[PDB]
Paper text:
Basement membranes are extracellular structures of epithelia and endothelia that have collagen IV scaffolds of triple α-chain helical protomers that associate end-to-end, forming networks. At the C-termini, interactions occur between the trimeric NC1 domains of two protomers, forming a hexamer of these domains reinforced by sulfilimine cross-links. Recent studies in one of our laboratories revealed that the NC1 domains function as recognition modules, directing the selection and assembly of α-chains into protomers and networks.
We validated the use of self-assembled recombinant NC1 domains to reflect natural structures by generating the same α121NC1 hexamer as previously isolated from BMs from a 2:1 mixture of pure α1NC1 and α2NC1 chains. Crystals of recombinant α121NC1 diffracted X-rays to 2.8 Å resolution and had the same architecture and folding as the α121NC1 hexamer isolated from BMs (the r.m.s.d. for the superimposition of all Cα atoms of the hexamer is 0.48 Å). The recombinant α121NC1 hexamer was composed of two identical protomers formed by two α1NC1 domains and one α2NC1 domain. Each individual chain (designated α1NC1α121 and α2NC1α121) had an identical fold and relations to its natural counterpart. Thus, recombinant NC1 chains seem to be appropriate for the formation and structural characterization of collagen IV NC1-domain assemblies. Therefore, the covalent modifications and/or cross-links found in natural α121NC1 hexamers or potential directive roles of the collagenous domains or other macromolecular components do not seem to be essential for the correct self-assembly of α121NC1. In fact, we show here that 2:1 mixtures of α1NC1 and α2NC1 chains spontaneously generate the natural α121NC1 heterohexamer. Spontaneous assembly has been proposed for α121NC1, where the α2NC1 chain shows a higher affinity to interact with α1NC1 than with itself.
Author numbering:
A (entry chain F): 5 to 227
B (entry chain E): 4 to 226
C (entry chain D): 4 to 228
D (entry chain C): 5 to 228
E (entry chain A): 3 to 228
F (entry chain B): 3 to 229
The structure:
């Protein structure tokens, strides 16, 4: 009973790739931050797909048997949509958060699923005897508040985001506010030419329109 | 067959493998190591969380100068805790035994997953899956400093049968003593009263006895 | 039904896929990356610890203002290393001199599930009933280099089992194109635990050249029949 | 002109010593926490005496010419009072009796803190006069690994009243303050030996048997 | 004169003049903080340690126990107070002699008596304590975090908590590689303006664009006795 | 004499002599920084707080909200400036009274005037400012990191940034268990020698082996104002 988790990066429920039956839908969870420590859910795994959304989907308990819910300064992070940031750059609150949160689908697969990386602008071909589920971009890691964050296993479908976003995730707080922040970095595999592997990498600052020219491509395959 | 099911009893007695499943080994429930004030975690659902031989210091480190130190610095280990009452002083040598949770690795016919409700009610296994145990949604933990780690929500490790405010113990490797310290936090998923979306989470504090109803429930299911 | 196993040679040569498995692709052994002073690790047992193309900077970072920087800050990459010694001057290694330092890996398709068992002794652990051996090694658990940042291995993953024990099993590479070994680069191994000394207070031990493997736990990677 | 800084550890402001003119009173600021990175003020220096209290007394800016105030998840830490530990986080006005008050005075000479590392109170060095007697306050941690410490020469390492929880956490956005279970206070110990201790023996102390293990101090001023 | 020292930062390429009542010791470049082995250590801007006579993108080296000292040989940082110089129209890192117009200049001055900074916590100027004369006015600069959220800060009694000119990005990030640049995570924290009546009220979230930045920034004054 | 203090560190087992013009208050042991609950907190070497009258591997305790205080019961560190005493040939933890010969001694001296440090950023000794007399010379000491890359540093204006004798490993790591040892991750950071010519260019990456160490370490001098 193999599983494949797919993220739409939009407000709509993503359809299961050709060959896989649907189990349940939910909201795309990237990572949580509790007591200033980041803990993540791998996007390729079903743990990145919570059935219910909350800016604070967790509480903490101590040795004195005292639990606190949304009482301190903790974070939750979800994959974001193409929904534009309000022009005032103000914290998004209440039910205005729904259009910002990505949706996901946990699908039952007849066989094992994997992701391949090219380290090139060209799409990496699937291994011999493996059929393609989807293509995308190489999503390695991310850091937001206190430069804390998590990443993805490069063999997992979670390292393969179907749609490239310069801001792929939104920061939500237990105070009930969500917003993009300047320190929210996203890390993607670089395009490396085979002839330049063991040469000094040439520094490149990429403007809008050139962003994906140095971003590696990926394909999620199933046997 | 071929899958590895891991059971954590949360008691000083080893848990039994379900019918048809042959036991590989029983050990001690390892949560995470802490070397150089950096926490590396073992997923409670994976067979790595079940270490056969217990020690306050079960690891050593080496530097590039061809020198290895064992129990020579201030490193730590963390193990899943039993129901045993909280000691007044740090427990020593033989008196540590009833505090350390036991585990079992069972050989399984199919991959076992954990599903979460984020609700008061027990989540049901999807079509074609049978339930193994009912527990509580165990997300993450922090103890000494900022260090800790967490559990994958798809992994059966995120589903502990018994809810406990402090489900793990700190074992100081060099001194050979273990103890519950006040900076231990256990993070659990919450109950959301709505269908799928929670707007602004209301702040609350929960004393002993009123806790379990706000903790999310889970089931571990096998194909 | 599509199981994967990743082997690391710990040398400049490609490792051969263990008995029963078929080769998919070769590459370079990636341990962990460090971007914005934070470390993210690829488990050595998974295919993600094996990239087809090496770079001292194999990643870039993007911000909310739709700007992406490649090798334009101070970021790191960490790769499994070879028996190749450190130079006389102990200066940073750059250019095609890095090639003999980087380990090679192989991603292999397995017919059955792969796992690692640990003896916690100097003895080699036997494979469980119904399982067959692939390779033996030493119990590799975790590592820290710069800023005490790093990552670790799942103990039931083939990544926790390095075939050859190395005091310095990894090399530190920077976006400047320089790779070097550093004093703070630690490698954590499972120690040997005796049945008697389980709940006893551990005896402090300091091992030198030729005594390093005396307290290192042994492992075997097994695949079910 | 040296500046003396007193912390009353009560909701009332402390009096400046006779002859020394009070510049201002305020609230005893321990440290800010921006971006989960703690920035501390030394309790012996006037910077710890912030004239106006707020759960969020700071803002932040980025190179995009944009500034945020109480918009993210930042913190502030303030020295605490004897006030009963609240069962639930205090809010708006009920915060008042929890925050310690301070005073910055104009001293004719430099004040220093001397530590005994012993049960007995240290006597001031020759040519120095006593100002107050306290306990040796070293460092603190609260949220994550974050916190900070006091300087042992600085009068701020000498708190008149010992408390295992000498500080409170004020959540800037929510506007609430509360004591949490991970708040540690660090104090210098009593060493029974003359000047050197070899192998320390681990000890756990319940309420009542604590203070006899805390190092004692005196804040002294040079005579002129 | 008993040896009291005050450090002024011009936040431009020109040397700052020693404030009235003080005499000049030496000039240099405004060092905010260094970062080695991914840990930040800073120098208080009011102290002379924030004023180094010589600039380098790597002004330090480290040594290990095996008697080996490495200079500009790992991935380390140095941070300097920055000029009004606009960021290049490519956001690409600044190398070589092109860095000079970006680095602030400083002056270490000897004061006859103690130097201190007062804070108003309003848009108004805080008055000097009775018997203290003014040296300069500015804005309340508390702390900063750049790479890996690591950074340092200023003591509020120290003159270094009082930058004469408010900057959104008061500091530039320099690397051992010999590259300096501004980054999106380089935050600068300033004391907020609060009203006496608002003190214990729940703070109102505010977002400030270009033209509204100094609206909620507290003011400060650096004073000197006699 | 308004109450000015100068702290001198011998970096030996001997008590350092107060520089010319200053009177001795007390002697002690050179404390660099402590590390409690994984956070490092440092005492500036130029201040009297870096000079503690009594030594311990664990000179502090901690207390929780439950009014329970733990002493030397967890995994915490203390760090002390060290002597030129050689590390044992076995390289094993040093315990008990065997620690004494490794711990540097300090002296807190009452000064008539304010004390500062000047840094040249060259191999040459920077002269004292106009109207300032020289107390001692040394090497520019900026920061340090040991366990978990946590540590602290010095203020460059303070005399504590001016260590008299250059050491590749200037400090030792002590644990609350009662053991002290040098470790491979213990780095010391010093100001580098910069030239006015290559002030605004690419810094040349250099690795220095034994004997070449002090060739790039900046020089400093601690000065005190004339009365
Ligand atoms: Cl919260
Ligand atoms: Cl240890
Ligand atoms: Cl505790
Ligand atoms: Cl880089
Ligand atoms: Cl090194
Ligand atoms: Cl805030
Ligand atoms: Cl709590
Ligand atoms: Cl460098
Ligand atoms: Cl940026
Ligand atoms: Cl301890
Ligand atoms: Cl070591």
């Amino acid at each position: 009973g193999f599983l494949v988790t797919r993220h739409s990066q939009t407000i709509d429920d993503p359809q299961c790739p050709s060959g896989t039956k649907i189990l349940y839908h939910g909201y795309s969870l990237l990572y949580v931050q509790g007591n200033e420590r980041a803990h993540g859910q791998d996007l390729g795994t079903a743990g990145s797909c919570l059935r219910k959304f909350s800016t604070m989907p967790f509480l903490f308990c101590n040795i004195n048997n005292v639990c606190n819910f949304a009482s301190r300064n903790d974070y939750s992070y979800w994959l974001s949509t193409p929904e534009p940031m309000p022009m005032s750059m103000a914290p998004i609150t209440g039910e205005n958060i729904r259009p910002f949160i990505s949706r996901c689908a946990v699908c039952e697969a007849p066989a094992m699923v994997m992701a391949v990386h090219s380290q090139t602008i060209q799409i990496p071909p699937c291994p011999s005897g493996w059929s393609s589920l989807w293509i995308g971009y190489s999503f390695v890691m991310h850091t937001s508040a206190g430069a804390e964050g998590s990443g993805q296993a490069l063999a997992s479908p979670g390292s393969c985001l179907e749609e490239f976003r310069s801001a792929p995730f939104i920061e939500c707080h237990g105070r009930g506010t969500c917003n993009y922040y300047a320190n929210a970095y996203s890390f993607w595999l670089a395009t490396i030419e085979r002839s330049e592997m063991f040469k000094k990498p040439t520094p490149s600052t990429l403007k809008a329109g050139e962003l994906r020219t140095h971003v590696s491509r990926c394909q999620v395959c199933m046997r | 067959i071929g899958y590895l099911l891991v059971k954590h009893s949360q008691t000083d007695q080893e848990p039994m493998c379900p019918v048809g499943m042959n036991k590989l080994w029983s050990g001690y429930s390892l949560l995470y190591f802490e070397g150089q004030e950096k926490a590396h975690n073992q997923d409670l659902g994976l067979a790595g969380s079940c270490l056969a031989r217990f020690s306050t210091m079960p690891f050593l480190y080496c530097n590039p100068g061809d020198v290895c130190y064992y129990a020579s610095r201030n490193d730590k280990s963390y193990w899943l805790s039993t129901t045993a009452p909280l000691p007044m002083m740090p427990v020593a040598e033989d008196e540590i035994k009833p505090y350390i949770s036991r585990c079992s690795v069972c050989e399984a016919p199919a991959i076992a997953i954990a599903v979460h409700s984020q609700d008061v009610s027990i989540p049901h296994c999807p079509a074609g899956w049978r339930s193994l145990w009912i527990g509580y949604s165990f997300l993450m933990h922090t103890a000494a400093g900022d260090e800790g780690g967490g559990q994958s929500l798809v992994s059966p490790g995120s589903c502990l049968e018994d809810f406990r405010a402090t489900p793990f113990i700190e074992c100081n490797g060099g001194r050979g003593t273990c103890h519950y310290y006040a900076n231990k936090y256990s993070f659990w998923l919450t109950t959301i009263p709505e269908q799928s979306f929670q707007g602004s989470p209301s702040a609350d504090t929960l004393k002993a006895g009123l806790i379990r109803t706000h903790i999310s429930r889970c089931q571990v299911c096998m194909k």
